[PDB]
Ligand SMILES: CCN(CC)c1ccc2c(c1)Oc1cc(N(CC)CC)ccc1C2c1ccccc1C(=O)OCCOCCn1cc(CO[C@@H]2O[C@@H](C)[C@@H](O)[C@@H](O)[C@@H]2O)nn1
């Protein structure tokens with residue numbers, strides 16, 4: 001019943017792009033510092049995930065649009081939207097490096113599996129674990145990636161950790177999740193939409209706890225960015241066809257201009 005969203009951000013402006021799947025069509029809204037507007041992206045799909053990276057100041061966007069079991073990758077490289085080489089379900093994606101490496105996690109029929117890009121083609125990764133819902137975040141430590149995948153069946157969410165030596169279960173404690181991370185520590189915020197309500201758990205480096213965020217919504221996507229050492233987070237909560245943007249900028253959650 002709800003609409004499904006995915007969101008990505010970049011820069012110290014920042015620019016934001018929000019992709020919304022509604023009745024089988026994905027559309028896009030965009031922020032460049034002074035107001036929202038309708039973006040150029042428009043392609044069919046029932047669920048959506050997104051990641052993006054910068055090479056210098058040039059943004060590259062990848063939108064993963066799922067229908068049935070088929071996911072179609074869409075590519076922004078500064079020159080229109082074009083179909084990617086990637087080959088119902090629900091996806092989560094993350095990327096790192098200037099290469100880039102991509103990893104796309106697909107919840108299909110209760111199992112989550114992984115497809116990876118490393119510059120020379122798509123291949124099936126080692127991640128294979130139960131779940132009805134997936135979200136993902138990652139960070140670099142210099143040049144080594146660390147990945148956390150949040151896998152949900154029922155109301156139970158299991159964190160999976162990749163840290164250079166195989167997957168292991170993390171200590172984090174079908175609902176729908178979204179995740180973001182920042183720093184080298186790192187900090188993590190995970191948001192969960194369950195029975196019409198979105199709540200938040202957070203990692204310091206030292207134990208999980210419940211965050212302050214609590215708003216209605218059957219579907220959540222998030223994005224975040226750093227200005228110096230201050231984190232700025234945007235959470236997009238959807239009920240029916242309405243999406244509200246809540247904003248963390250260091251002092252409580254303010255209502256955003258998103259429409
Ligand atoms: C920093 C500047 N950038 C980055 C934007 C750049 C650099 C080099 C090229 C660039 C662009 O573009 C091309 C384009 C072509 N064409 C255009 C008609 C023919 C295909 C030819 C050479 C260059 C080349 C190129 C020139 C000389 C020698 C080699 C290449 C090359 O690697 O080649 C790059 C393309 O082919 C080989 C490597 N590659 C890159 C990709 C990108 O794939 C997409 O992006 C990935 C991240 C995934 O999402 C994937 O699923 C998706 O399809 N696929 N294959």
Ligand SMILES: CCN(CC)c1ccc2c(c1)Oc1cc(N(CC)CC)ccc1C2c1ccccc1C(=O)OCCOCCn1cc(CO[C@@H]2O[C@@H](C)[C@@H](O)[C@@H](O)[C@@H]2O)nn1
Pocket residue numbers: 148159161169170171172186188203205206
């Ligand atoms: C006091 C300031 N802090 C801040 C956390 C701190 C810093 C370093 C350590 C600290 C604590 O504790 C230990 C403890 C040990 N022991 C004795 C108790 C061995 C059993 C040994 C070395 C240090 C180390 C340590 C010492 C020297 C060199 C490295 C480390 C280290 O790797 O530190 C790594 C950071 O550990 C902090 C606590 N932590 C981190 C995690 C990682 O958790 C995973 O990853 C997270 C991102 C989440 O996804 C989480 O859900 C998931 O399970 N689990 N516990």
Ligand SMILES: CCN(CC)c1ccc2c(c1)Oc1cc(N(CC)CC)ccc1C2c1ccccc1C(=O)OCCOCCn1cc(CO[C@@H]2O[C@@H](C)[C@@H](O)[C@@H](O)[C@@H]2O)nn1
Pocket residue numbers: 014016031033034035234245247255256257258
């Ligand atoms: C948080 C406290 N408030 C109340 C609105 C506030 C906020 C911003 C300013 C404020 C005061 O004062 C100034 C003053 C100056 N001057 C003149 C004296 C020079 C020193 C210059 C800038 C600011 C700005 C300013 C800073 C950054 C971006 C825009 C503005 C602005 O002028 O716009 C006012 C904010 O609302 C108008 C529209 N808007 C909103 C945003 C940020 O909003 C959020 O953040 C975005 C990233 C998106 O997520 C968006 O959907 C979400 O609503 N940026 N523009």
